[PDB]
Amino acid sequence: KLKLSDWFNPFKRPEVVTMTKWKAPVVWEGTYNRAVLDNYYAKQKITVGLTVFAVGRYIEHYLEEFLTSANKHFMVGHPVIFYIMVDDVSRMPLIELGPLRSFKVFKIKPEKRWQDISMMRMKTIGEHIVAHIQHEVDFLFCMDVDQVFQDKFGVETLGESVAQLQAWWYKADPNDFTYERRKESAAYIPFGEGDFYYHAAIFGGTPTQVLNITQECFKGILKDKKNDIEAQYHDESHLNKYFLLNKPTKILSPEYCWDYHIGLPADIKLVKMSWQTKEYNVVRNNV
Ligand SMILES: CC(=O)N[C@@H]1[C@@H](O)[C@H](O[C@@H]2O[C@H](CO)[C@H](O)[C@H](O)[C@H]2O)[C@@H](CO)O[C@H]1O
Numbered sequence: 537k538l539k540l541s542d543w544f545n546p547f548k549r550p551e552v553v554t555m556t557k558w559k560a561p562v563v564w565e566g567t568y569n570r571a572v573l574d575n576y577y578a579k580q581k582i583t584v585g586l587t588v589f590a591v592g593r594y595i596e597h598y599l600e601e602f603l604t605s606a607n608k609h610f611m612v613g614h615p616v617i618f619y620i621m622v623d624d625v626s627r628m629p630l631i632e633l634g635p636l637r638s639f640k641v642f643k644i645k646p647e648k649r650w651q652d653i654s655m656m657r658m659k660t661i662g663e664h665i666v667a668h669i670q671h672e673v674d675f676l677f678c679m680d681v682d683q684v685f686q687d688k689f690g691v692e693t694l695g696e697s698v699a700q701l702q703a704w705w706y707k708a709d710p711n712d713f714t715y716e717r718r719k720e721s722a723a724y725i726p727f728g729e730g731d732f733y734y735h736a737a738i739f740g741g742t743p744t745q746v747l748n749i750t751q752e753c754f755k756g757i758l759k760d761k762k763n764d765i766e767a768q769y770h771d772e773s774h775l776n777k778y779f780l781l782n783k784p785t786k787i788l789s790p791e792y793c794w795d796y797h798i799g800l801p802a803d804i805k806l807v808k809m810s811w812q813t814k815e816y817n818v819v820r821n822n823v
């Protein structure tokens with residue numbers, strides 16, 4: 537029976553938000569005791585999954601760097617399975633993996649609009665969870681491919697439902713959050729509501745929770761299509777609506793998904809993951 541106090545110490549980072557009003561911890565560098573967690577999870581012999589999509593030129597531009605960095609930094613010391621979804625398997629970079637890492641690749645259909653490529657991930661992830669992921673891992677993370685692991689991204693991030701604080705808005709007020717503001721959309725969040733602005737580049741939890749996260753998000757995506765509307769920030773707008781209704785049991789600080797374009801302020805102690813510079817002119821084929 538793992539207890540929050542066993543591994544989480546908010547007092548180590550007094551200058552930032554370390555606890556939500558619903559008692560969920562916000563994991564910042566310095567507040568976690570990975571050694572305690574590694575031993576605890578090793579004894580339970582857990583396996584962690586990681587899904588990543590790479591469709592079109594996202595493959596040549598980001599897949600190798602992502603996987604290479606994941607192999608080295610993701611859940612080191614524990615069995616891990618990388619689930620790679622690509623539209624063209626012949627372009628799969630196939631790198632050498634280290635101890636406790638293995639993978640499996642799936643060929644998927646490339647949607648015509650990049651917006652749909654991004655949103656369809658929700659439907660696809662759920663299908664795979666039902667078909668096999670639920671039987672293969674204890675925890676699963678779903679990530680964007682356009683980023684790179686920079687340091688240990690370990691078990692301190694595991695939980696029932698895990699959300700990521702977006703690097704640009706972690707200190708902003710709810711009314712400045714770029715939530716979908718049109719009531720016609722299923723992702724609508726009225727001003728005066730909201731806890732944080734979560735980044736869709738990273739989210740996870742147990743297979744059961746992620747299944748519900750992805751299922752609900754895609755239901756909203758399909759609903760909007762029937763009402764001839766598309767969320768301003770697509771799947772991210774829907775993810776934020778979901779996490780508003782179903783609070784995450786754990787939140788990761790921006791240190792786990794940092795945009796170096798902002799620079800490196802005092803609150804960012806040790807970057808575990810960083811954004812890749814945007815290259816839409818090459819990787820995207822439509823507006
Ligand atoms: C203050 C400000 O406008 N900052 C923006 C960032 O928000 C922006 O990042 C994008 O943010 C949206 C949600 O608003 C979504 O998370 C996108 O995936 C993310 O890239 C950034 C562009 O990289 O520019 C800043 O100026």
Ligand SMILES: O=c1ccn([C@@H]2O[C@H](COP(=O)(O)OP(=O)(O)O)[C@@H](O)[C@H]2O)c(=O)[nH]1
Nearest residue numbers: 589590591592594650653654680681682819
């Ligand atoms: O043409 C596309 C559009 C999106 N994606 C995937 O969907 C994620 C979301 O897209 P993107 O990174 O372009 O979103 P941004 O973070 O820049 O908003 C990407 O990381 C990829 O994993 C992809 O493979 N091909």
Ligand SMILES: [Mn+2]
Nearest residue numbers: 680681682737
């Ligand atoms: Mn991205």
